[PDB]
Amino acid sequence: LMDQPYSKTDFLMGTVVTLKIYDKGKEDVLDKGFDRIKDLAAKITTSDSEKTSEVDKINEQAGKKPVKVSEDVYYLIQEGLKYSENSGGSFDITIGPLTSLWHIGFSDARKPSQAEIDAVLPLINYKDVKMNDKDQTVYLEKEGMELDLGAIAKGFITDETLKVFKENKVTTSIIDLGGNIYVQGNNPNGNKWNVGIQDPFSPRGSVIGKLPESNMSIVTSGIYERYLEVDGKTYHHILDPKTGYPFDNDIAGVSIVSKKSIDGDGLSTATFSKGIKGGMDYIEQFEGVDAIFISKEKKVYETSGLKGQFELTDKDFQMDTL
Ligand SMILES: Nc1ncnc2c1ncn2[C@@H]1O[C@H](COP(=O)(O)OP(=O)(O)O)[C@@H](O)[C@H]1O
Ligand SMILES: [Mg+2]
Ligand SMILES: [Mg+2]
């Protein structure tokens, strides 16, 4: 193991992405990782006017005909439908018509009018996604429907990147896709990795504290990471598919700790829909999954798996308990 890792940085999917590998001799696995990330993102993205992705193709054939898709996309949509069901539809990968409408995080983001929202809500229904395992085809049942895999793409890509790493016998590494961290192995000095917990009020990278972790995903969401501002008001990018407006409750930010990064992303949105007290309860129903919640009043909560493990460093915040 090396003290200083092999490191590469890029800007993809609208975020800074960095990979670090500490195993001597494996510098070329960084390119294998970024290659994989780029291949997955090209299949998944809807927001490239120059290329038609598999997701784009599914969307343009809504109500028309099923679409042959690759194993990567078929798999990701299957998992998205499970998270959709498991969430009670507060998370729904068919939110596409609604997220296209606000298009938060792009220079043309806007607050649509209620009448425009009302027109797209009847299109949001994960149950209208028709999978065929035999054919490996995906069919949206009604015209107008749009898939949006945004809320699970970085988790899936992280896990797929780790698979690339393990295939090349990488043992110690850090994968950072902006709002997703995976830490593999331990620090070369033998300690667990000290994972920063994001300060939801400050730019990405600022932290309120550290959580020691090894071989774990940490996924972070917050009310200010991608948002729109108009008339002195803020609209973040995690939308209520039943309302058309961003979830409004006491959560400022949440970091979810799990074995798989996709479960991190997956569980993120149903957690936002439930608030602090309800989101902790939801997370307590999932074995091997925990969370640190940060409320709008700057108080910090741990689920049972994590109780007493977060090390708070920012005095503006305070540990609290239900
Ligand atoms: N309720 C929802 N269910 C499913 N997907 C959503 C929902 N709201 C927004 N999305 C899509 O998923 C993305 C949110 O992903 P998330 O992981 O929470 O943010 P980040 O990209 O900062 O990690 C949005 O940008 C949008 O494309
Ligand atoms: Mg997510
Ligand atoms: Mg994410």
Author numbering: 37 to 358
Describing publication, verbatim:
A Mg2+‐dependent protein flavin mononucleotide (FMN) transferase (FmnB; UniProt: LMRG_02181) in EET is responsible for the transfer of electrons from intracellular to extracellular by hydrolyzing cofactor flavin adenine dinucleotide (FAD) and transferring FMN. FmnB is a flavin transferase belonging to ApbE family; it hydrolyzes flavin adenine dinucleotide (FAD) and converts flavin mononucleotide (FMN) to pheromone lipoprotein (PplA; UniProt: LMRG_02182), and divalent cations are required this process. Here, we report a series of crystal structures of apo‐FmnB and FmnB complexed with substrate FAD, three inhibitors AMP, ADP, and ATP, revealing the unusual catalytic triad center (Asp301‐Ser257‐His273) of FmnB. Notably, the structures of FmnB in complex with distinct inhibitors, together with biochemical assays, revealed that all three inhibitors indeed inhibited the activity of FmnB by occupying the binding site of the FAD substrate.
For FmnB‐ADP, the phosphate groups of ADP form salt bridges with Lys190 and His273 and a water‐mediated hydrogen bond with Thr305. Similarly, the Mg2+ ions near the ADP coordinate Asp301, Ala187, Asn216, and the phosphate groups as well as water molecules. Furthermore, while FmnB‐ADP is similar to FmnB‐AMP, the binding pocket for ADP is smaller, and there are no significant conformational changes in Met49 and Phe142. In particular, Arg262 is more distant (4.3 Å) from the β‐phosphate group of ADP, possibly due to spatial repulsion between Arg262 and the phosphate group. Remarkably, the structures revealed that the key residue Arg262 of FmnB was profoundly affected by ADP but not AMP or ATP. Moreover, considering the effect of Arg262, only the presence of ADP causes Arg262 to move away from the center of the cavity. Curiously, ADP exhibited a stronger inhibition ability than AMP and ATP. In summary, these charge repulsion and space constraints result in the strongest inhibition of FmnB enzyme activity by ADP compared with that by AMP and ATP.
